[PDB]
């Protein structure tokens, strides 16, 4: 067991593999599919290559009662090496829609397998979100400074992708959309700007009702969020500084280059005005002769 954790990069294969696995067990309709999740671990970024289904039963009146075939997994791992001998156990995926409080007990059982603290990778099977439709958590046990005992609790790790040469080209090979959520032409990036601005608007709004809910829905004082909230205020911009004036002087600069680049285009288009007219001049004679 390593605590070596910072990030989670996710193969596109995992997301998709887990989406089908959910519907082919047919534990769906508010019934969970839980499988093993395979990849590299013992490094800061946890690198998730593959996933398999596990036979699983979910009591839906009580999510605190489930079936897990422990034997099977040992059987499966031998097969994982055939595929790739860097695949080892690193956790188990959950099928969303989000984190639950029945997940800690399931996490327990998954400590007899992993050499790293069992990963919980929430693969949303509905595709909600404003980034990748994945959240990542890992269970870490830590004292709480409020006065209560040692809990095991899920801290989020960011979600990310990285991919192999074969996988990445396969992605484009399947796909055929030119994509307004990545860069491209001018119009394509204009779509990204408006979204990013609205993305700040959506997320800042979420903090306003979270501060209110601690004192008007009686959520607890969570020190870990609010310390980060304070460092936003320290790094926040100001006004009337010579720093903020230098910005204006740099606005002048770059727009002037654009001004001259635009004017440069216009020279070129006025020559094509003139060339077509040379094309017009010839066509006059031919018209007279016929």
């Amino acid at each position: 067991m390593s605590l070596q954790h910072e990030k989670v990069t996710i193969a596109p294969l995992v997301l998709l593999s887990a989406l089908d696995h959910y519907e082919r067990t047919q534990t769906k309709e508010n019934k969970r599919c839980v499988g093993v999740i395979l990849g590299d671990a013992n490094s800061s970024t946890i690198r998730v290559t593959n996933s398999f289904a596990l036979p699983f039963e979910e009591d839906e009146k009580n999510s605190d009662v489930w079936f897990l075939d422990h034997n099977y997994i040992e059987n499966m791992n031998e097969m994982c090496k055939k595929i790739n001998a860097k695949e080892k156990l690193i956790g188990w995926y959950h099928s969303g829609p989000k984190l639950r409080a029945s997940d800690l007990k399931i996490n327990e059982l998954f400590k007899k397998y992993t050499q790293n603290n069992p990963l919980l990778l929430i693969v949303d099977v509905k595709q909600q979100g404003v980034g990748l439709p994945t959240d990542a958590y890992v269970a870490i046990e830590q004292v709480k400074d409020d006065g209560t005992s040692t809990e095991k609790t899920f801290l989020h790790l960011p979600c990310t992708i990285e991919a192999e040469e074969a996988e990445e080209i396969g992605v484009e090979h399947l796909l055929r959309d030119v994509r307004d959520q990545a860069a491209g032409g001018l119009s394509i990036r204009l779509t990204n700007q408006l979204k990013s601005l609205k993305g700040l608007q959506s997320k800042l709004k979420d903090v306003v009702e979270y501060l209110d809910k601690v004192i008007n829905k009686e959520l607890p004082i969570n020190h870990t969020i609010l310390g980060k909230l304070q460092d936003v205020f320290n790094l926040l911009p100001n006004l009337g500084t010579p720093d903020d004036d230098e910005i204006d002087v740099e606005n002048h600069d770059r727009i002037n280059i654009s001004n001259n680049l635009q004017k440069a285009l216009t020279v070129k288009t006025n020559d094509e005005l003139m060339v077509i007219y040379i094309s017009n001049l010839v066509r006059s004679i031919i018209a007279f002769d016929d």
Binding site: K98, R100, F154, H156, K203, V207, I225, V232
Partner: peptide, 14 residues
């Protein structure tokens, strides 16, 4: 910061 905070609000309701 805000990005990470936003994912952590959901956890706190649960």
């Amino acid at each position: 910061h805000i990005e990470t905070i936003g994912h952590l609000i959901t956890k706190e309701e649960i």
